[PDB]
Design an enzyme around this catalytic site. Structure first.
Site, PDB file in Angstrom:
ATOM      1  N   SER A  39       0.846  -1.180   0.000  1.00 25.72           N
ATOM      2  CA  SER A  39       0.000   0.000   0.000  1.00 25.72           C
ATOM      3  C   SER A  39       0.885   1.234   0.000  1.00 25.72           C
ATOM      4  O   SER A  39       1.993   1.223   0.544  1.00 25.72           O
ATOM      5  CB  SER A  39      -0.918   0.031   1.226  1.00 25.72           C
ATOM      6  OG  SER A  39      -1.716   1.196   1.246  1.00 25.72           O
ATOM      7  N   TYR A  63      -2.792  -0.495  10.243  1.00 24.06           N
ATOM      8  CA  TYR A  63      -2.801  -1.131   8.931  1.00 24.06           C
ATOM      9  C   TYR A  63      -1.619  -0.660   8.087  1.00 24.06           C
ATOM     10  O   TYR A  63      -0.936  -1.469   7.447  1.00 24.06           O
ATOM     11  CB  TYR A  63      -4.135  -0.827   8.260  1.00 24.06           C
ATOM     12  CG  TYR A  63      -4.200  -1.066   6.777  1.00 24.06           C
ATOM     13  CD1 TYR A  63      -4.596  -2.291   6.276  1.00 24.06           C
ATOM     14  CD2 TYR A  63      -3.891  -0.053   5.875  1.00 24.06           C
ATOM     15  CE1 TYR A  63      -4.675  -2.513   4.927  1.00 24.06           C
ATOM     16  CE2 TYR A  63      -3.961  -0.271   4.524  1.00 24.06           C
ATOM     17  CZ  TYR A  63      -4.353  -1.497   4.053  1.00 24.06           C
ATOM     18  OH  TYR A  63      -4.427  -1.706   2.695  1.00 24.06           O
ATOM     19  N   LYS A 118       1.737  -2.639   6.193  1.00 18.84           N
ATOM     20  CA  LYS A 118       2.141  -2.487   4.802  1.00 18.84           C
ATOM     21  C   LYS A 118       3.604  -2.055   4.688  1.00 18.84           C
ATOM     22  O   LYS A 118       4.323  -2.500   3.789  1.00 18.84           O
ATOM     23  CB  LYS A 118       1.188  -1.508   4.116  1.00 18.84           C
ATOM     24  CG  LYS A 118      -0.254  -2.032   4.083  1.00 18.84           C
ATOM     25  CD  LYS A 118      -0.316  -3.405   3.415  1.00 18.84           C
ATOM     26  CE  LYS A 118      -1.735  -3.743   2.984  1.00 18.84           C
ATOM     27  NZ  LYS A 118      -1.824  -4.948   2.111  1.00 18.84           N
TER      28      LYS A 118
HETATM   29  N1  LIG Z   1      -8.548  -0.423  -2.357  1.00 14.26           N
HETATM   30  C1  LIG Z   1      -7.587   0.292  -1.785  1.00 14.26           C
HETATM   31  O1  LIG Z   1      -7.769   1.467  -1.505  1.00 14.26           O
HETATM   32  C2  LIG Z   1      -6.255  -0.327  -1.479  1.00 14.26           C
HETATM   33  C3  LIG Z   1      -5.158   0.514  -1.361  1.00 14.26           C
HETATM   34  C4  LIG Z   1      -3.918  -0.031  -1.072  1.00 14.26           C
HETATM   35  C5  LIG Z   1      -3.801  -1.405  -0.910  1.00 14.26           C
HETATM   36  N2  LIG Z   1      -4.867  -2.205  -1.022  1.00 14.26           N
HETATM   37  C6  LIG Z   1      -4.662  -3.644  -0.832  1.00 14.26           C
HETATM   38  O2  LIG Z   1      -5.247  -4.396  -1.901  1.00 14.26           O
HETATM   39  C7  LIG Z   1      -5.619  -5.688  -1.421  1.00 14.26           C
HETATM   40  C8  LIG Z   1      -7.035  -6.015  -1.891  1.00 14.26           C
HETATM   41  O3  LIG Z   1      -7.918  -4.983  -1.444  1.00 14.26           O
HETATM   42  P1  LIG Z   1      -9.267  -4.541  -2.222  1.00 14.26           P
HETATM   43  O4  LIG Z   1      -9.496  -3.095  -1.880  1.00 14.26           O
HETATM   44  O5  LIG Z   1      -9.230  -4.994  -3.664  1.00 14.26           O
HETATM   45  O6  LIG Z   1     -10.368  -5.380  -1.392  1.00 14.26           O
HETATM   46  P2  LIG Z   1     -11.832  -5.820  -1.911  1.00 14.26           P
HETATM   47  O7  LIG Z   1     -12.162  -5.241  -3.272  1.00 14.26           O
HETATM   48  O8  LIG Z   1     -12.783  -5.679  -0.744  1.00 14.26           O
HETATM   49  O9  LIG Z   1     -11.531  -7.370  -2.136  1.00 14.26           O
HETATM   50  C9  LIG Z   1     -11.405  -8.185  -0.990  1.00 14.26           C
HETATM   51  C10 LIG Z   1     -11.083  -9.585  -1.446  1.00 14.26           C
HETATM   52  O10 LIG Z   1     -10.379 -10.223  -0.383  1.00 14.26           O
HETATM   53  C11 LIG Z   1     -11.133 -11.368   0.011  1.00 14.26           C
HETATM   54  N3  LIG Z   1     -10.834 -11.609   1.435  1.00 14.26           N
HETATM   55  C12 LIG Z   1     -11.077 -10.774   2.465  1.00 14.26           C
HETATM   56  N4  LIG Z   1     -10.636 -11.325   3.626  1.00 14.26           N
HETATM   57  C13 LIG Z   1     -10.096 -12.524   3.319  1.00 14.26           C
HETATM   58  C14 LIG Z   1      -9.456 -13.634   4.053  1.00 14.26           C
HETATM   59  N5  LIG Z   1      -9.296 -13.571   5.381  1.00 14.26           N
HETATM   60  N6  LIG Z   1      -9.037 -14.720   3.366  1.00 14.26           N
HETATM   61  C15 LIG Z   1      -9.176 -14.806   2.031  1.00 14.26           C
HETATM   62  N7  LIG Z   1      -9.750 -13.833   1.298  1.00 14.26           N
HETATM   63  C16 LIG Z   1     -10.225 -12.706   1.877  1.00 14.26           C
HETATM   64  C17 LIG Z   1     -12.579 -11.032  -0.343  1.00 14.26           C
HETATM   65  O11 LIG Z   1     -13.436 -12.155  -0.497  1.00 14.26           O
HETATM   66  P3  LIG Z   1     -14.229 -12.832   0.738  1.00 14.26           P
HETATM   67  O12 LIG Z   1     -15.003 -11.733   1.425  1.00 14.26           O
HETATM   68  O13 LIG Z   1     -15.070 -13.873   0.023  1.00 14.26           O
HETATM   69  O14 LIG Z   1     -13.106 -13.395   1.581  1.00 14.26           O
HETATM   70  C18 LIG Z   1     -12.353 -10.381  -1.683  1.00 14.26           C
HETATM   71  O15 LIG Z   1     -12.118 -11.396  -2.668  1.00 14.26           O
HETATM   72  C19 LIG Z   1      -5.463  -5.648   0.100  1.00 14.26           C
HETATM   73  O16 LIG Z   1      -4.261  -6.300   0.505  1.00 14.26           O
HETATM   74  C20 LIG Z   1      -5.309  -4.185   0.443  1.00 14.26           C
HETATM   75  O17 LIG Z   1      -4.512  -4.022   1.626  1.00 14.26           O
HETATM   76  C21 LIG Z   1      -6.084  -1.707  -1.302  1.00 14.26           C
HETATM   77  O1  LIG Z   2      -3.135   2.032   2.797  1.00 16.45           O
HETATM   78  C1  LIG Z   2      -4.126   2.676   2.308  1.00 16.45           C
HETATM   79  N1  LIG Z   2      -4.154   4.009   2.136  1.00 16.45           N
HETATM   80  C2  LIG Z   2      -5.354   4.342   1.591  1.00 16.45           C
HETATM   81  C3  LIG Z   2      -5.891   5.559   1.218  1.00 16.45           C
HETATM   82  C4  LIG Z   2      -7.171   5.605   0.678  1.00 16.45           C
HETATM   83  C5  LIG Z   2      -7.948   4.459   0.481  1.00 16.45           C
HETATM   84  C6  LIG Z   2      -7.474   3.203   0.835  1.00 16.45           C
HETATM   85  C7  LIG Z   2      -6.206   3.132   1.376  1.00 16.45           C
HETATM   86  C8  LIG Z   2      -5.364   2.037   1.860  1.00 16.45           C
HETATM   87  O2  LIG Z   2      -5.647   0.788   1.891  1.00 16.45           O
END
Ligand SMILES: NC(=O)c1ccc[n+]([C@@H]2O[C@H](COP(=O)([O-])OP(=O)(O)OC[C@H]3O[C@@H](n4cnc5c(N)ncnc54)[C@H](OP(=O)(O)O)[C@@H]3O)[C@@H](O)[C@H]2O)c1
Ligand SMILES: O=C1Nc2ccccc2C1=O
Ligand SMILES: NC(=O)c1ccc[n+]([C@@H]2O[C@H](COP(=O)([O-])OP(=O)(O)OC[C@H]3O[C@@H](n4cnc5c(N)ncnc54)[C@H](OP(=O)(O)O)[C@@H]3O)[C@@H](O)[C@H]2O)c1
Ligand SMILES: NC(=O)c1ccc[n+]([C@@H]2O[C@H](COP(=O)([O-])OP(=O)(O)OC[C@H]3O[C@@H](n4cnc5c(N)ncnc54)[C@H](OP(=O)(O)O)[C@@H]3O)[C@@H](O)[C@H]2O)c1
Ligand SMILES: NC(=O)c1ccc[n+]([C@@H]2O[C@H](COP(=O)([O-])OP(=O)(O)OC[C@H]3O[C@@H](n4cnc5c(N)ncnc54)[C@H](OP(=O)(O)O)[C@@H]3O)[C@@H](O)[C@H]2O)c1
Ligand SMILES: O=C1Nc2ccccc2C1=O
Ligand SMILES: O=C1Nc2ccccc2C1=O
Ligand SMILES: O=C1Nc2ccccc2C1=O
Lengths: 260, 260, 260, 260
Positions: free
Chosen positions: A148, A161, A165
C-alpha cells in the site's frame, strides 16, 4: 484495454483474495495473457460469482477454492488444490489484507494489532513458504505482494494497517534476497486509494468525497484509482519483461509523493 | 567525550533493555546531561552491575528494575516503578530487540516469526501506549525507537529480524503522526554493526572479522561502531535541539548506503 | 533556551550565506559552543549587522567577509580569509541557496536553470574542493549541506529549485563516500518551511495564514519552523556526537512525510 | 523471446541516444509493439547501422537523425524531424547520458562538472520542454528518463556522474508533478550494471570477472544486466499498463539494494 500480451502461456498463478477488486482484476489480466489461475477468498458465493464472471468473458483456465487465508489448514488446501488442478505453480500474488480498525493508533488493542500482522504479513510469509518448493521446481518464477502507499505515508485512522504495509515492503525485500538463488523474483505494488469495497468508506457519495479526497491526498493525475490500474503492473512484475527486477515496490497512486 | 550539554535537567527517561551495550550508553549520556533514568532488563544481576557502573561515575539519578519487556505484567511494573521513583515520564527509549534466529528466512518457523514481532515491535507499541498519558501530561516529550540499518538493507542470516526493524521505521512514523497532537516527538535510530554481545558473533576474533566485515558491509569510515556512537544521536533526538523533527530515522552505520 | 553544550572549543567553522536566517542561527550556535566562525554573504552591510548582533551577545570569536558564493574569486577569498584569521578550518557549512524563479517548471529558462545549479549545487562542490585539504590537515572534520524537504517532495512553483536540492542529497552522499578516507563526515539538513525572508511569500499573512499553511503542508507538529530549529541539528552533525554518521540527510520539517 | 505485446499501434516515440545499447533495445521493443520511432545519436554511421539492423528484422516504422543531444540546434531538429516524418509525438524516452570522467570526485574540474549536468540533466529538461506541447496535443502521453542505480548508491570512480543521476530522480518527479495536468506521465528507470560500451571497463574480463563483479556489486540474481533487461520496463512505463503511475523510478539492477 487489450494488450495482445501473451506473456503467461503455460504458467500457473495463485492470486489470493481475488474474487473482487484488485485481486480479481489481476487474475483476469493473467488469464487474458494465457495463464492458468487459481483464485481464493473466504466465501464460496464470491468464488462462484468470480469464476462465472471470468468464464463469461471466455477466460476458462481458472479455478476457485474458498478458504480463510490466515488458516494454516486453508493455506495448504489452496496450494494443494492448485497443484491438483494445474500440476504446478509459477506465480503467487499475495493480494490479501484486512483493514478492520478505524481510529487512533493508541486505541488499537494488542489483539487487533496481532490480527493485523497475522493476516497482512504472516499469511503472506506462510503462503510463500508453501509455494516456494513448487515454484523453485519450475526453475523459478515470481511472487508479488500487494502492499500500500500507506506503507510509505502513514495515514490517519488506519495507521496500524499502514505499519503492516511498511512491513510488507521489508518482507518483499527479504524474500527477494533469499529466493534469488532459486530464480524467484519477489516484488510488490503499493497502490494508493483504489475504488473497491475496502476503501468505499473514504470516497462514498460521488464527487464530494471523490473530488475533495482526490486533492486531499494530493493526487497529481486528479482521479482515484480503479482495480485494473494495478493489473498491468502485476502482470509486468510476474513476466519476463521484469526478469532483472527483484526486491522492488512500485507505487500505483496517481503521482502521490512519499519516497525518492 | 564530555559535551557539557545539560539538555535534560528535570527530565525523566525510561531506557528499555539498557544494562549493556547501546541502551546502557544511552542511559549514561542522558544521566550525564542531568536526566533521571530508569533502566530495565531481564536479569537482576545485569541491573545491579549497570546501576553500580553508573553510580561509580557519579551518575546517581538512576534506578533499575528487572523484567521481561514483552511481559504485559512487567511493562506495567516498569512504568509504575518509574512514576514511583521520579514522579513523571518525559522520554521513552525503546531499545529492546531480540535476534535469536540465524539461517534462511524460509527456515523461520511461524512461532519464531511471531516471537520476533512480539518482542521487536509489539512490545514497543505496548510501552508507548503505557507511557503516553504520562508524557502527554508533561506537555510533551520524546519517544525513540532503536531500529537497525537492516531495516533498509535486508541482511543474510537474520532477514526476519531485519523485517521487524523495517516495521519499526513504519511504527516510528505512525506514532510520530499520531502523537504530534500531544507534542510527543517520535524518532528512531538505525545503527549498523555495533560491537555488542548481540553482534559479537559477526566480528569475533579481532581484525579478520573486524577488518573484512568492515569492508564487506562497505563501511565508508572503515570501522565498526561502538555503543557510544548511538548515544549522542538519541540525546539529540530526545532534546529540544530536535524540537522540529518527528517521524524520522537516523542511520548510524559509518556511511553504509541503503536509502536517499 | 541554552543547551550549555560546548562541543566546539578550538574548532573553526565557515558558514556560508550566514548573515540572516538559518545560516546566522547556525553560526550563532557554533559560537555559543566555543567555535571560531567565519560568516559571509554578498552585502557588506549584512555582514556588519550580523557581526554586531553576535558581538553584542558576547560571541566575539567571529569574523565576516562579503562576497558572492558562486564567484570563484570570492570563494578563494573566503577560504583564505578564514585561514588568515583563525589558522585552520575544521567545519564547512554550505548553507547558501537561492530561488529566484516562481512559476511552472516548463517556464524556467535554460539560463535560470543553469544559474540555480551554479549557486545551489556547484558552489557547494567548489567550496568543498577548497576547504578539503585544510580540514584533512586537522585529521578530519565535517561538511554540512543545507538542502530542503523539497528535495524529497517536489513543490509547486519552485520545482526547479527543488531539483537542485535533490541534487544536494546526492552530492552530500557522493562527498561523504569520497571524503571518508580523510575522516571528513558529510551530512545535510532538509528543512521544511522555515520562517525567513526566502520563504516569506508562503507564510506571510498573520498567525492564521500560517496555521492554514501548516495544514496544507501537512505539518504534524502544527507550526512553521524558525531558523533556530536548524541550528541544533547542524551543531550535532558537526560535533563528535555524530562521529559514526556520514552521508545522511536529516529532514527538519515538523513531521511532513516524504521518505522512509 | 517475444511478448506478443502490441500496446503502441498508432503511437510515435522519440528515443534519444538510441543507436546502441539500452536506447536501441528500447526503440526495438516499441517498434515490435507497433510504434513509430525516431532514434538519434551523434554519429550518422551509427544511425545508419541501427536503422538497417532494425529494418532487417522487419521493423520499418523507424527513422533516424544524427545530432548532439545537448545542442539546442540539434534538439529542435530532432523534434521537428519527428513531426515531419510521423506527424505527432506521444512518447519521449530521454535515454542519453555520458560519463567521461573516472577518478575521485575531488578531481572533477568545474568544467567537467558542468558538462556532466549539461548532457545528463539539462538536455532532458530541454527535450521535455520541446516535446511537451506536441504530447499534450495528443491528450497526453509519456516521458521516461534513464537514470541509474548510482542515483541511489553513490559509486566510486564515477560519483559525479552518479550525482547527475540523483538529479534525474528529482527531475522525473518534478516533471511528473508539473505535467500531470496534461495527462503526461513522467517516470524513470534506474538500471544497475548493464553490459554496454559505457560500462565495459567494469565487466570486461570474461565470465568470471563478471561473476566476481556480481558478488562485489551484491546482485541477488547473480548476473549482469543486458540492454533488453530495460526495454520491457520502458514499454510498460510508456503504455496504458501504467496509466495510474507517474513520478516513479524503477530500479533494474538484479536485486541490488539502495532504497526502501
Ligand atoms: N482499495 C484500496 O484502496 C487499497 C489501497 C492499497 C492497498 N490495497 C490492498 O489491496 C488488497 C485487496 O484490497 P481490495 O481493496 O481490492 O479489497 P476488496 O475489493 O474488498 O476485495 C477483498 C477480497 O479479499 C477477500 N478476502 C477478504 N478477507 C479474506 C481472508 N481472510 N481470506 C481470504 N480472502 C479474503 C474477499 O473475499 P471474501 O469476502 O469472500 O473473503 C475479496 O475477494 C489488500 O491487501 C489491500 O490491503 C487496497
Ligand atoms: O493504505 C491505504 N491508504 C489508503 C488511502 C485511501 C484508500 C485506501 C487506502 C489504503 O488501503
Ligand atoms: N549491536 C548491533 O549490531 C545492533 C545493530 C542494529 C540494531 N541494534 C539494536 O540495538 C538494541 C540493543 O542491542 P545491543 O546490541 O546493545 O544488545 P546487548 O549489548 O546484548 O544488550 C542487550 C540488552 O537487552 C537486554 N534484554 C535482552 N532481552 C530482553 C528482554 N526480553 N526484556 C528486557 N531486556 C532485555 C539485556 O539484558 P538482560 O539479558 O538482563 O535482559 C541487555 O541489557 C536492539 O534493539 C538491537 O536490535 C543492535
Ligand atoms: N526558509 C525556508 O523555508 C527554507 C527551507 C528549506 C531550505 N532552505 C535553505 O536554507 C538556506 C538559507 O536560506 P534562508 O531561508 O535562511 O534565507 P535568508 O534568511 O533569506 O538568508 C539568506 C542568506 O544568504 C545570503 N546570500 C544570498 N545570496 C548569496 C550569495 N550569492 N552569496 C553569499 N550569500 C548569499 C544572504 O545575504 P546577502 O543578501 O547579503 O547575500 C542571506 O545572508 C538556503 O540554502 C535555502 O535553500 C530554506
Ligand atoms: N550501461 C550501464 O551500466 C548503465 C547503467 C545505468 C544507466 N545507464 C544509462 O543508460 C543510458 C544509455 O547508455 P548505454 O549504457 O546504453 O550506452 P551505449 O551502449 O554506449 O550507448 C550510448 C548511446 O548514446 C549515444 N550518444 C552518446 N553521446 C551522445 C550525444 N551527445 N547525443 C546523442 N547521442 C549520444 C551513442 O551514439 P553516438 O556515439 O553515435 O552519439 C550511443 O547510441 C545512459 O543514460 C546511461 O547513463 C547505463
Ligand atoms: O540489523 C542488523 N544488521 C547488522 C549487521 C551487523 C551486526 C549486527 C546487525 C544488526 O542487528
Ligand atoms: O522548504 C522550503 N520552503 C520554502 C519556501 C520558499 C522557497 C523555498 C523553500 C524551501 O525549500
Ligand atoms: O549502473 C551503472 N553501471 C555503470 C558502469 C559504468 C559507467 C556508469 C554506470 C552506471 O550508471
Amino acid at each position: 484495454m487489450p494488450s495482445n500480451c501473451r506473456r503467461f502461456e503455460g504458467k500457473v498463478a495463485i492470486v489470493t483474495a481475488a474474487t473482487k477488486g484488485i485481486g480479481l482484476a489481476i487474475a483476469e489480466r493473467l488469464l487474458d495473457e494465457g495463464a492458468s489461475v487459481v483464485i481464493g477468498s473466504r466465501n464460496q458465493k464470491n468464488v462462484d460469482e468470480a469464476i462465472e464472471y471470468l468464464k463469461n468473458k471466455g477466460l476458462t483456465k481458472v479455478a476457485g477454492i474458498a478458504g480463510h487465508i490466515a488458516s494454516t489448514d486453508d493455506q495448504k488446501k489452496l496450494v494443494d488444490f492448485t497443484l491438483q488442478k494445474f500440476g504446478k505453480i509459477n506465480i503467487l500474488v499475495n493480494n490479501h489484507g484486512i483493514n478492520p480498525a478505524f481510529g487512533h493508533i493508541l486505541e488499537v488493542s494488542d489483539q487487533v494489532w496481532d490480527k493485523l500482522f497475522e493476516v497482512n504479513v504472516k499469511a503472506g510469509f506462510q503462503m510463500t513458504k508453501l509455494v516456494h518448493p513448487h515454484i523453485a521446481k519450475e526453475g523459478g518464477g515470481a511472487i508479488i505482494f500487494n502492499a500500500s502507499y500507506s506503507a510509505y505515508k502513514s495515514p490517519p485512522g488506519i495507521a496500524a494497517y499502514g505499519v503492516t504495509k511498511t512491513t510488507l515492503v521489508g518482507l518483499t525485500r527479504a524474500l527477494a534476497m533469499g529466493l534469488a538463488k532459486d530464480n524467484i523474483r519477489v516484488n510488490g505494488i503499493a497502490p494508493g486509494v483504489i475504488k473497491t469495497k475496502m476503501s468505499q468508506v473514504l470516497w462514498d457519495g460521488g464527487e464530494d468525497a471523490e473530488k475533495e479526497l482526490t486533492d486531499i491526498q494530493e493526487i497529481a493525475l486528479g482521479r482515484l484509482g480503479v482495480p485494473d490500474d494495478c493489473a498491468g503492473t502485476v502482470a509486468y512484475l510476474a513476466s519476463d519483461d521484469s526478469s532483472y527486477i527483484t526486491g522492488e515496490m512500485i507505487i500505483i497512486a496517481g503521482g502521490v509523493q512519499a519516497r525518492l
